[PDB]
Write an enzyme that holds these catalytic residues in place. Structure first.
Site, PDB file in Angstrom:
ATOM      1  N   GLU A 107      -4.185   6.965   7.734  1.00  0.00           N
ATOM      2  CA  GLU A 107      -5.168   6.141   7.041  1.00  0.00           C
ATOM      3  C   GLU A 107      -5.422   4.838   7.789  1.00  0.00           C
ATOM      4  OE1 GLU A 107      -7.408   6.628   4.749  1.00  0.00           O
ATOM      5  OE2 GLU A 107      -7.960   4.523   5.020  1.00  0.00           O
ATOM      6  N   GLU A 127       2.503   1.384  -3.464  1.00  0.00           N
ATOM      7  CA  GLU A 127       1.550   1.919  -4.433  1.00  0.00           C
ATOM      8  C   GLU A 127       1.423   3.432  -4.319  1.00  0.00           C
ATOM      9  OE1 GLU A 127      -1.793   3.189  -3.814  1.00  0.00           O
ATOM     10  OE2 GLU A 127      -2.208   3.473  -5.944  1.00  0.00           O
ATOM     11  N   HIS A 128       1.393   3.968  -3.093  1.00  0.00           N
ATOM     12  CA  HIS A 128       1.392   5.427  -2.969  1.00  0.00           C
ATOM     13  C   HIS A 128       2.707   6.048  -3.423  1.00  0.00           C
ATOM     14  CE1 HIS A 128      -2.319   6.386  -0.404  1.00  0.00           C
ATOM     15  NE2 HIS A 128      -2.408   5.104  -0.708  1.00  0.00           N
ATOM     16  N   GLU A 156       5.157   9.673   2.532  1.00  0.00           N
ATOM     17  CA  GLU A 156       3.996   8.810   2.333  1.00  0.00           C
ATOM     18  C   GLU A 156       3.894   7.685   3.350  1.00  0.00           C
ATOM     19  OE1 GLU A 156       1.556   9.783  -0.484  1.00  0.00           O
ATOM     20  OE2 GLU A 156       2.822  11.256   0.517  1.00  0.00           O
ATOM     21  N   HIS A 193       0.831  -1.198   0.000  1.00  0.00           N
ATOM     22  CA  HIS A 193       0.000   0.000   0.000  1.00  0.00           C
ATOM     23  C   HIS A 193       0.870   1.255   0.000  1.00  0.00           C
ATOM     24  CE1 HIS A 193      -3.496   2.398   2.039  1.00  0.00           C
ATOM     25  NE2 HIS A 193      -3.421   2.628   0.741  1.00  0.00           N
TER      26      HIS A 193
END
EC number: 3.4.24.-
Length: 965
Positions: free
Chosen positions: A175, A77-78, A150, A74
């Site tokens: 998140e 991917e960011h 990130e 994740h």
């Protein structure tokens, strides 16, 4: 000329740009040819589905199998979407929508794969987006400071004071904090983790906030080099563009720079349990619920086979939908209608995202004492299903629904195909077997016709005899999140204690450099972009033939690869209707097909509609002429959908609707009118700007007034007034009069969209159906609807030229220019509204709108400064290029085969008229934009209209130029 005919010329074993054709299969029922290629040097798999659809799609798939709960795919991917080697600008994804003519651009992170799809209709745009996606995914600049931004970092509460204590920061970190305040995500995550405890499904792939900060930059770079490598990738292409160009681009841009590796990424099989298990978890008490003692959730889960065996997976998915979907399911009548809880447990039903799928059922909102009662009830319900089996109508309804949902033609068909094959393909399955839906349906129907106890033995095997059961319960504790905060602070102290002062100064200086990076506006001019020369000058002509039948009704047949579907539409004019009965037609169209016909009551009618057709709807349409402001066509559109084999049943249903509508069923009618009135009444804010643009334009053209009567706020108020009447019968007597003025054959025209192989039978069925049926001065007005809203809805309409006037293209391009570069920035950044823009309709109404604006007078002031700005001409030629790109992204927006061609049948626009308007969009220049802005948009030069929906405004109430209604 077709795609699959040349696609069948690809022979097995052909070598094309380093790839080898391994399998070519013709799928005539799906109008496509599948081609399977593998690159010999790299081992990357390639699947090409050639189908005559202009929305070409590329997709790339990476198998990412994490072995800890750090959240590396994740965060990765960011991080990969923040910059690349050849394109060092920030965020190519968000900074590539304005430079392309794309229709879709997104990314997905499932539990065990990451997917990067895009779609576009222009071949050069396809080449450009393909190059930017290969460079972004395969060669990102993976800068350490982007990983600090990130992922996770230590940061002071005020970045300028290095004496305040350090805390954890990061976007993904918060998140996941917000993921684990959600009780539903805790429940689903722990269900998956406890149910599959052997391998990668046992961890939190998104990241647990207490174990995430142990990830280093070097581990992220190593993970990217091992999993974001073409040998661990799946390539997907779909559409009509030449295959050779795509393969040539893939080979010459990406694959040559790599060498073969062997990914250790295969997902092992779950070892079956010998005995069911129970676990207890704790969560945080929610404040939206009203009872605190009744907040315990429990669920029961069963292990199912793998998705590799296509047949058994399809049948068990069907069985799980048969058991759990809808209020007619056994578990619904056993659990929901028992009054024990409030809703089903999370992840209820069939869950097929992992390799081994799983089924889950349970309840939420129960008292903790009822756990064994619920488990015994579920066991007894499974016993009853084993003892009684299933009724045949529900099985036919489910098989017909799955056949329609697979075969129905959407505008984003390639997205449904890649989402439908991603899960199976990720675990080395054959995606073509999921495409041959006719074979699996035939085999299932044969297995039911041969063995009447097939489904009962399946329910027995996978539910009564399946020992891999998990019963999991969760009850909230009021000090859960404080405990979590304490342990997180303990890990915080454990990690901060080890820092030397030089490390603390390095973190402080990196924090200031990060704040500069996050603040400094950067350039995106290094990305490629399309010009006015890469847009196709002409559109491919759509083939039509109109056949007059029985004896003067025109019927339009359009042969299209509709994927085994027949779409029937009919449009009946309103020229014969008496003017008093006009406002009651939305009610009429919304109830015409829902009260029963002939010997079928309304429940059997609804069962027949759901079992034979895909849906039958009626809706009023006002179709303006394109060459006269004061000419329009008014009528009602009958629309239907069916499979090829159920066509005569559908036309018999239509004959019964046209000849014997049941205008006497009042009891169910009261339910239907109260339901449509409630549904339209709750939906006023979400389409408020549409209602405002319809109300403001009522006084400008007859079409606007008719649109206000048929679909404006007047229709909502009238429908509510009718729905509050206790005696509905004098309204019910108006409906046969509508039947006698509408449902006749004097002024009718029809359209049919179907496959070319079905066309003669459709011509016969349609002619039998037609033989079986009987034979201005504008003036300003300001209106404020006092609504109990927290936000406003503003609309301004300006009267402009119609579609076929050459000036229409200039007005449209100027409107898109104004939206992109003035009103968006001024109202959004300064004003604070959630949505705002300008639109130009096909009839010639220039419409201004605002969505959720806290002010009113400031909106009109931004209108005055916006028209002043548009007349000032203070924009460059690059703004004209961007406006042309956006307008060609809007007017050339994809139309599904089920609406091809809808514009010719409804609005009377030929391909000649569209080509003429396209050359008018090509011929617009900057000086003609200055002339048209100085000729029509100026104050006192044209007629205006104003309307505002929103809360009380005292200053507007003292304005005598406003009318309050």
């Amino acid at each position: 000329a077709a795609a699959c005919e040349r696609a069948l010329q690809y022979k097995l074993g052909d070598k094309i740009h380093g790839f080898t054709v391994n399998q070519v299969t013709s799928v005539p029922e799906l109008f496509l040819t599948a081609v399977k290629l593998t690159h010999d040097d790299t081992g990357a798999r390639y699947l090409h589905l050639a189908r005559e659809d202009t929305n070409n799609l590329f997709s790339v798939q990476f198998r990412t199998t994490p072995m800890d709960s750090t959240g590396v795919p994740h965060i990765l991917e960011h991080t990969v979407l923040c910059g690349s080697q050849k394109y060092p600008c920030r965020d190519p994804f968000f900074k590539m929508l304005n430079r392309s003519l794309s229709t879709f651009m997104n990314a997905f992170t499932a539990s065990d794969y990451t997917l990067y799809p895009f779609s576009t209709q222009n071949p050069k745009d396809f080449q450009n987006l393909l190059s930017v996606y290969l460079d972004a995914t395969f060669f990102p600049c993976l800068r350490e400071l982007d990983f600090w931004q990130e992922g996770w970092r230590l940061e002071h509460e005020n970045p300028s004071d290095p004496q305040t204590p350090l805390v954890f920061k990061g976007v993904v970190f918060n998140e996941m904090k917000g993921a684990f305040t959600d009780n539903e995500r805790i429940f689903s995550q722990h269900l998956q983790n406890r149910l599959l405890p052997d391998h990668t499904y046992s961890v939190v792939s998104g990241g647990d906030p207490l174990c995430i900060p142990e990830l280093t930059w070097e581990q992220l770079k190593q993970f990217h080099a091992t999993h974001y490598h073409p040998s661990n990738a799946r390539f997907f292409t779909y559409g009509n563009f030449p295959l050779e160009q795509h393969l040539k681009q893939i080979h010459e841009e990406a694959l040559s720079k790599f060498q073969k590796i062997e990914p250790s990424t295969v997902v092992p099989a779950q070892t079956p349990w010998d005995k069911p298990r129970e676990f207890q978890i704790t969560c945080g008490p929610d404040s939206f619920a009203t009872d605190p003692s009744k907040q315990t959730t429990v669920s029961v889960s069963f292990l199912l086979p793998d998705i590799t065996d296509t047949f058994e997976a399809f049948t068990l998915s069907l069985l799980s939908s048969l058991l759990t979907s809808g209020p007619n399911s056994p578990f619904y009548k056993a659990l929901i209608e028992s009054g024990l809880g409030t809703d089903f447990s999370p992840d209820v039903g069939y869950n097929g995202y992992t390799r081994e799928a799983y089924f889950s059922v349970g309840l939420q909102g129960i008292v903790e004492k009822d756990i064994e009662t619920v488990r015994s009830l579920i066991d007894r319900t499974i016993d009853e299903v084993v003892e009684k089996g299933f009724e045949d109508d529900r099985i036919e309804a489910l098989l017909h629904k799955i056949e329609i949902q697979m075969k129905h033609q959407s505008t984003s068909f390639g997205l449904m195909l890649t989402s439908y094959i991603a899960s199976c393909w990720n675990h080395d399955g054959d995606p073509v077997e999921l495409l041959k839906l006719g074979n699996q349906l035939a085999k299932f129907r044969q297995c039911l016709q041969e063995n009447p106890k097939f489904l009962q033995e399946k329910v027995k095997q996978y539910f009564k005899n399946n020992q891999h059961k998990l019963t999991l319960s969760m009850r909230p504790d009021d000090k859960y999140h404080e405990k979590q905060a304490q342990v997180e602070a303990t890990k915080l102290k454990q990690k901060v204690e080890a820092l030397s002062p030089g490390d603390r100064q390095q973190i402080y200086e990196k924090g200031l450099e990060l704040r500069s990076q996050q603040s400094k506006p950067q350039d995106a001019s290094c990305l490629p972009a399309l010009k006015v020369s890469d847009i196709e000058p002409t559109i491919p002509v759509t083939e039509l033939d109109v056949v007059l039948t029985a004896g003067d009704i025109p019927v339009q047949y359009c042969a299209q690869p509709t994927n085994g579907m027949v779409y029937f539409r009919a449009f009946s004019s309103l020229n014969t209707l008496p003017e008093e009965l006009r406002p009651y037609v939305p009610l009429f169209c919304s109830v015409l097909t829902k009260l029963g016909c002939g010997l079928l009551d309304y429940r059997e009618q609804a069962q027949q509609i759901e079992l034979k057709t895909g849906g039958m709807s009626a809706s009023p349409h006002v179709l303006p002429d394109d060459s006269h402001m004061d000419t329009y066509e008014q009528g009602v559109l009958f629309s239907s959908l069916c499979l090829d084999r159920n066509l005569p049943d559908m036309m018999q249903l239509w004959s019964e609707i046209f000849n014997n509508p049941c205008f006497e069923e009042e009891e169910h009618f009261k339910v239907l009118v109260k339901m449509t009135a409630q549904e339209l009444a709750n939906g006023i804010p979400d389409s408020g700007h549409l209602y405002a643009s319809i109300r403001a334009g009522r006084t400008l053209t007859p079409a606007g007034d008719l649109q206000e009567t048929f679909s404006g706020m007047d229709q909502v108020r009238l429908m509510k007034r009718i729905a509050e009447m206790t005696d509905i019968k004098p309204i019910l007597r108006k409906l046969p009069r509508i039947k006698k003025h509408l449902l006749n054959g004097d002024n009718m025209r029809c359209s049919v969209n179907a496959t070319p192989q079905q066309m003669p039978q459709t011509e016969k069925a349609v002619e039998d159906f037609l033989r079986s049926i009987g034979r201005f001065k504008p003036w300003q007005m300001k209106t404020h609807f006092l609504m109990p809203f927290p936000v406003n809805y503003v609309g301004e309409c300006i009267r402009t030229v119609p579609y076929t006037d050459p000036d229409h293209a200039s007005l449209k391009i100027l409107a898109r220019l104004m939206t992109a570069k003035f009103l968006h920035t001024e109202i959004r950044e300064k004003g604070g509204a959630y949505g705002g823009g300008a639109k130009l309709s096909h009839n010639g109404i220039f419409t201004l709108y605002s969505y959720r604006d806290p002010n009113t007078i400031e909106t009109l002031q931004s209108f005055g400064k916006a028209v002043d700005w548009a007349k000032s001409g203070k924009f460059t030629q690059q703004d004209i290029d961007e406006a042309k790109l956006s307008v060609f992204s809007t007017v050339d927006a994809p139309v599904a085969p089920s609406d091809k061609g809808m514009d010719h049948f409804l609005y009377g626009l030929s391909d000649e008229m569209k080509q003429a308007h396209r050359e008018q969009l090509f011929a617009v220049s900057h000086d003609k934009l200055l002339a048209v802005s100085d000729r029509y948009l100026g104050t006192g030069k044209s007629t205006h209209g104003l309307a505002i929906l929103g809360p009380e405004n005292p200053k507007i109430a003292k304005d005598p130029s406003w009318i309050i209604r």
